[PDB]
Design a protein around this ligand. Sequence first.
Ligand SMILES: [Mg+2]
Ligand SMILES: [Mg+2]
Ligand SMILES: [Mg+2]
Ligand SMILES: [Mg+2]
Ligand SMILES: [Mg+2]
Ligand SMILES: [Mg+2]
Ligand SMILES: [Mg+2]
Ligand SMILES: [Mg+2]
Ligand SMILES: [Mg+2]
Ligand SMILES: [Mg+2]
Ligand SMILES: [Mg+2]
Ligand SMILES: [Mg+2]
Ligand SMILES: [Mg+2]
Ligand SMILES: [Mg+2]
Ligand SMILES: [Mg+2]
Ligand SMILES: [Mg+2]
Ligand SMILES: [Mg+2]
Ligand SMILES: [Mg+2]
Ligand SMILES: [Mg+2]
Ligand SMILES: [Mg+2]
Ligand SMILES: [Mg+2]
Ligand SMILES: [Mg+2]
Ligand SMILES: [Mg+2]
Ligand SMILES: [Mg+2]
Ligand SMILES: [Mg+2]
Ligand SMILES: [Mg+2]
Ligand SMILES: [Mg+2]
Ligand SMILES: [Mg+2]
Ligand SMILES: [Mg+2]
Ligand SMILES: [Mg+2]
Ligand SMILES: [Mg+2]
Ligand SMILES: [Mg+2]
Ligand SMILES: [Mg+2]
Ligand SMILES: [Mg+2]
Ligand SMILES: [Mg+2]
Ligand SMILES: [Mg+2]
Ligand SMILES: [Mg+2]
Ligand SMILES: [Mg+2]
Ligand SMILES: [Mg+2]
Ligand SMILES: [Mg+2]
Ligand SMILES: [Mg+2]
Ligand SMILES: [Mg+2]
Ligand SMILES: [Mg+2]
Ligand SMILES: [Mg+2]
Ligand SMILES: [Mg+2]
Ligand SMILES: [Mg+2]
Ligand SMILES: [Mg+2]
Ligand SMILES: [Mg+2]
Ligand SMILES: [Mg+2]
Ligand SMILES: [Mg+2]
Ligand SMILES: [Mg+2]
Ligand SMILES: [Mg+2]
Ligand SMILES: [Mg+2]
Ligand SMILES: [Mg+2]
Ligand SMILES: [Mg+2]
Ligand SMILES: [Mg+2]
Ligand SMILES: [Mg+2]
Ligand SMILES: [Mg+2]
Ligand SMILES: [Mg+2]
Ligand SMILES: [Mg+2]
Ligand SMILES: [Mg+2]
Ligand SMILES: [Mg+2]
Ligand SMILES: [Mg+2]
Ligand SMILES: [Mg+2]
Ligand SMILES: [Mg+2]
Ligand SMILES: [Mg+2]
Ligand SMILES: [Mg+2]
Ligand SMILES: [Mg+2]
Ligand SMILES: [Mg+2]
Ligand SMILES: [Mg+2]
Ligand SMILES: [Mg+2]
Ligand SMILES: [Mg+2]
Ligand SMILES: [Mg+2]
Ligand SMILES: [Mg+2]
Ligand SMILES: [Mg+2]
Ligand SMILES: [Mg+2]
Lengths: 136, 52, 386
Amino acid sequence: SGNGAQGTKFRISLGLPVGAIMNCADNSGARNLYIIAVKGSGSRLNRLPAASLGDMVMATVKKGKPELRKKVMPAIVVRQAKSWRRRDGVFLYFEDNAGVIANPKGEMKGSAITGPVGKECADLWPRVASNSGVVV
Amino acid sequence: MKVEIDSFSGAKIYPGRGTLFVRGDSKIFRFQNSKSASLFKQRKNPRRIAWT
Amino acid sequence: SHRKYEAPRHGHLGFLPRKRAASIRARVKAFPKDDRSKPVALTSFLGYKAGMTTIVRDLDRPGSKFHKREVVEAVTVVDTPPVVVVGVVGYVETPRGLRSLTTVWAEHLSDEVKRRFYKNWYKSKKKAFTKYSAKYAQDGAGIERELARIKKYASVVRVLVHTQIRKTPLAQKKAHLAEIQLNGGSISEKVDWAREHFEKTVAVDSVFEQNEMIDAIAVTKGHGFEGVTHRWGTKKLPRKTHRGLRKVACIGACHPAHVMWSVARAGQRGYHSRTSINHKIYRVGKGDDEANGATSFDRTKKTITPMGGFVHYGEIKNDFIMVKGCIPGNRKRIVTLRKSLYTNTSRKALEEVSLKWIDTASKFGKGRFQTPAEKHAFMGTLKKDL
RNA sequence: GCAGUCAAGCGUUCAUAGCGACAUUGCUUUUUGAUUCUUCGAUGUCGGCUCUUCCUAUCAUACCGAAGCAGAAUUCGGUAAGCGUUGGAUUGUUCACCCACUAAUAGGGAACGUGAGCUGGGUUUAGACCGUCGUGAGACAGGUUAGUUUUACCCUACUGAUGAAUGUUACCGCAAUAGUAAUUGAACUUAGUACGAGAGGAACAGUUCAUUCGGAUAAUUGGUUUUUGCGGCUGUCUGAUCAGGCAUUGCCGCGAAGCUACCAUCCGCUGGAUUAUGGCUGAACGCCUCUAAGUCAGAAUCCAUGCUAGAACGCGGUGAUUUC
RNA sequence: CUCUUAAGGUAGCCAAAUGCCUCGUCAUCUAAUUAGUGACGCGCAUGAAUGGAUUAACGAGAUUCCCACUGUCCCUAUCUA
RNA sequence: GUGAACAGCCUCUAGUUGAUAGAAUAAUGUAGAUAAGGGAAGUCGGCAAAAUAGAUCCGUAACUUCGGGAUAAGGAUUGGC
Ligand SMILES: [Mg+2]
Ligand SMILES: [Mg+2]
Ligand SMILES: [Mg+2]
Ligand SMILES: [Mg+2]
Ligand SMILES: [Mg+2]
Ligand SMILES: [Mg+2]
Ligand SMILES: [Mg+2]
Ligand SMILES: [Mg+2]
Ligand SMILES: [Mg+2]
Ligand SMILES: [Mg+2]
Ligand SMILES: [Mg+2]
Ligand SMILES: [Mg+2]
Ligand SMILES: [Mg+2]
Ligand SMILES: [Mg+2]
Ligand SMILES: [Mg+2]
Ligand SMILES: [Mg+2]
Ligand SMILES: [Mg+2]
Ligand SMILES: [Mg+2]
Ligand SMILES: [Mg+2]
Ligand SMILES: [Mg+2]
Ligand SMILES: [Mg+2]
Ligand SMILES: [Mg+2]
Ligand SMILES: [Mg+2]
Ligand SMILES: [Mg+2]
Ligand SMILES: [Mg+2]
Ligand SMILES: [Mg+2]
Ligand SMILES: [Mg+2]
Ligand SMILES: [Mg+2]
Ligand SMILES: [Mg+2]
Ligand SMILES: [Mg+2]
Ligand SMILES: [Mg+2]
Ligand SMILES: [Mg+2]
Ligand SMILES: [Mg+2]
Ligand SMILES: [Mg+2]
Ligand SMILES: [Mg+2]
Ligand SMILES: [Mg+2]
Ligand SMILES: [Mg+2]
Ligand SMILES: [Mg+2]
Ligand SMILES: [Mg+2]
Ligand SMILES: [Mg+2]
Ligand SMILES: [Mg+2]
Ligand SMILES: [Mg+2]
Ligand SMILES: [Mg+2]
Ligand SMILES: [Mg+2]
Ligand SMILES: [Mg+2]
Ligand SMILES: [Mg+2]
Ligand SMILES: [Mg+2]
Ligand SMILES: [Mg+2]
Ligand SMILES: [Mg+2]
Ligand SMILES: [Mg+2]
Ligand SMILES: [Mg+2]
Ligand SMILES: [Mg+2]
Ligand SMILES: [Mg+2]
Ligand SMILES: [Mg+2]
Ligand SMILES: [Mg+2]
Ligand SMILES: [Mg+2]
Ligand SMILES: [Mg+2]
Ligand SMILES: [Mg+2]
Ligand SMILES: [Mg+2]
Ligand SMILES: [Mg+2]
Ligand SMILES: [Mg+2]
Ligand SMILES: [Mg+2]
Ligand SMILES: [Mg+2]
Ligand SMILES: [Mg+2]
Ligand SMILES: [Mg+2]
Ligand SMILES: [Mg+2]
Ligand SMILES: [Mg+2]
Ligand SMILES: [Mg+2]
Ligand SMILES: [Mg+2]
Ligand SMILES: [Mg+2]
Ligand SMILES: [Mg+2]
Ligand SMILES: [Mg+2]
Ligand SMILES: [Mg+2]
Ligand SMILES: [Mg+2]
Ligand SMILES: [Mg+2]
Ligand SMILES: [Mg+2]
């Protein structure tokens, strides 16, 4: 996760190390979300911090609104392509990796999320669930 | 505890088996194994796959 | 001159030396602390691991995102046919430790046990316990005398028992013999329980019940001589490195001028003794039961044995322990199963569990169906049949 | 580089909460120097990588004593090295610096650890360009580009593995000694509570997850494929068919088994004794005093429980012991 | 206007393979750039066949970035001879 | 024969079947392959690897010594009958 969050996330498989570029599913005018950090993370020699669904990452828009690039913002992962196993025993996965810009509280910068959203990501962030289309 | 159907082969997916896939729009897909999933991923047509 | 960055050491230094275990039957090195006010009963049990499979169940964990929710879980089934008391041992506290004082054996030991005492059974006269059986010729006496001795001097009492390996699928005819600590009441009451059970049988529903956490002593699967990368989880050297890279670069500084006991080196991986604790009992199998594999939710008449049979093991004709998750050792190997050394109130350890369904598909492949019945109903009548 | 003694001053007031001038006593050997003892019948150097262990002048974590400690936050100090101390942009760099995460991103040693372990970017052979110097050959503690990294099978060490001799052989055990392990964060709740004019704003108990580490394990999902298991395909060859050969496993799709992944799942014990500190009774000293005698509580400490080996010159209980 | 020593750096060009200071200043690229580029120039110590500036094509030459690609890495696993 | 082909692959005539051999398939290797998600975060530096690739048709930038750049780039297609 990160924080600003309501609740606890059960572990899901990491799929987005740093350097990963994931789609921006909001309406902020940002087409990209480039990951440079993962608020949850811990530390091991050479271990890239990597992120999963519903974590909050630090990021930089690399494509889209000029007023939106050349700066770090927080972002939240709403979809990941890396297969993870939920406690009900099922190994699901999405078709791209997508994220949405947010402030440190968790409050989204936009008001719409194109595409589906993972329940874990939604339960963790009320405001992501608010503006979500479909969940899971 | 439900049992779903493969969305290609029409096989029986028991708990924990197979894989689940969430396409672009939002249609949810299910494969009982790496076989039906691989065929789906090559875009084979089940109506042409003998054992379906 | 100080490692540039810190990292933790690789491997645990308390599972040394990383050699091959002595016995293939792992030792119980500890038994629970005896409360001598409960009935007499074994404290561990002999069994052969068969395989694994999947469970479903609701969760009972108030405050979890999965409370009152289905979860699927891997379980392992160990083939546990009743065990047979063939003797008793008397241990005495001494300023040099516990000591075996005498041992009193039963009058008739089966071939399963007799076998153990031989290396070439087929060409032996099978003279095993023939002159000891003569001790029973007398009214009692010699046996009664040594039984009286344990009652007077022993401070702990262990029964000898052995697997009935013949009830199982294994090619091994030779049965495994083990000491087990008696933890019922009075030292007197103990050997009595033991004498009373000579040649007789004990099942697992008399030791372990459902929702019990148990420990699981066993010898780990072997892999022979291993390089330091997979044996220790050592990092893999760059690709450019001359002379290979599944090594470690620095075996040591100049001083001490000696390879040190703690740097990682190639050699044996596997076949190690592990005591693995807090495995919760999910189902106690009844052998006679035709509904081993069934549930109060899924009522269909099936047994635990998966379709096609447990891979590399066989079928489960007998009583079995279903344990959550996994267990050291591989299929076919003996496993001592032991009661907890402590009273856990994990909540995770007090949860009463009730399964909803037990995966009974083939493991020898991507199994689709649970029962031969179900295969038929689904595929219809084939070119064979009728 | 680090630490003291004195106490003029800083500190609204007040030397010493936290600092501390003039002076003064010391410590360290990851600075730099001084020296030139050792090695010139020689065998490179810097940095990094990898990995282990040690120091403590402690950054984080545990428990405390202080405060100019209301709360939160911080700051000083004690016991403390048990346990962690990271991902990156530019640089050959160590260093430096910036981004970022974080409980924290402490400082050092082990031939300025570590080249028959790597790498070879830098430096520092021979090729070459520039600038400065020189009449010149050439020079530069200037810039630049290209420049071969040898051997272990010996001994010891370390890791694993057999093994003679204690009548013979077999089974079941003991436990000396040695090793040893877990780690840290968050949420919910306590509670918008304590405290506070307000701004703000805790903790224990309880619950749920997670990070780092570890030991296993393969039901599941994923990876691997000479199952050359099944099918597909090109070229050629066996007159055609059928069925096959060859193409250093011809190529493609699936592919059980085995192996295997924080890419998968399971599991990681609880009693005591103490430290700092706070006290108890209590003299010395008819008072006072945690201390002198005696004594209570008490920490990531220690010792056990537990866990791995089992002394091949440590031991116990038991079985059977030869006519060809 | 003057001094050394004959003249006194023109056209150009540049922190350039020539710049000590130096990781120069400004702009740009980046989350961050002792790197790269565009500029600036009292330039330690640029400069006109001791050739200066320009330049299409060419290069197993030195250098920076982008797309593609990827086991280089995260973080390792499996197979063949 | 395939094919642009004295290429690669397969064959005929002719010539060899000769390079100590047997049993196993630990580590670490030398040579050959493959990897979920990410995609240079590895590193002095994309070193090594990967990706592209024939042919037909369409299409094709700055600049230029007008010759080039240029297979620039970017696309569609391809068996059998
Ligand atoms: Mg690194
Ligand atoms: Mg800036
Ligand atoms: Mg598979
Ligand atoms: Mg060092
Ligand atoms: Mg250190
Ligand atoms: Mg050990
Ligand atoms: Mg290895
Ligand atoms: Mg492992
Ligand atoms: Mg090399
Ligand atoms: Mg090594
Ligand atoms: Mg290594
Ligand atoms: Mg198991
Ligand atoms: Mg299987
Ligand atoms: Mg004053
Ligand atoms: Mg004061
Ligand atoms: Mg000298
Ligand atoms: Mg000297
Ligand atoms: Mg010498
Ligand atoms: Mg100290
Ligand atoms: Mg005051
Ligand atoms: Mg205050
Ligand atoms: Mg505050
Ligand atoms: Mg403050
Ligand atoms: Mg101080
Ligand atoms: Mg230490
Ligand atoms: Mg750093
Ligand atoms: Mg971090
Ligand atoms: Mg030194
Ligand atoms: Mg050195
Ligand atoms: Mg060396
Ligand atoms: Mg060398
Ligand atoms: Mg070099
Ligand atoms: Mg040179
Ligand atoms: Mg050079
Ligand atoms: Mg060269
Ligand atoms: Mg060697
Ligand atoms: Mg040895
Ligand atoms: Mg110790
Ligand atoms: Mg509230
Ligand atoms: Mg106030
Ligand atoms: Mg024919
Ligand atoms: Mg025909
Ligand atoms: Mg041939
Ligand atoms: Mg693990
Ligand atoms: Mg005291
Ligand atoms: Mg005292
Ligand atoms: Mg006193
Ligand atoms: Mg502890
Ligand atoms: Mg333990
Ligand atoms: Mg022993
Ligand atoms: Mg011994
Ligand atoms: Mg003894
Ligand atoms: Mg003159
Ligand atoms: Mg002029
Ligand atoms: Mg002119
Ligand atoms: Mg200049
Ligand atoms: Mg330059
Ligand atoms: Mg420039
Ligand atoms: Mg760069
Ligand atoms: Mg001239
Ligand atoms: Mg000239
Ligand atoms: Mg070229
Ligand atoms: Mg590859
Ligand atoms: Mg590899
Ligand atoms: Mg010819
Ligand atoms: Mg050939
Ligand atoms: Mg000839
Ligand atoms: Mg030869
Ligand atoms: Mg990959
Ligand atoms: Mg990509
Ligand atoms: Mg780096
Ligand atoms: Mg580098
Ligand atoms: Mg880099
Ligand atoms: Mg290359
Ligand atoms: Mg590929
Ligand atoms: Mg056609």
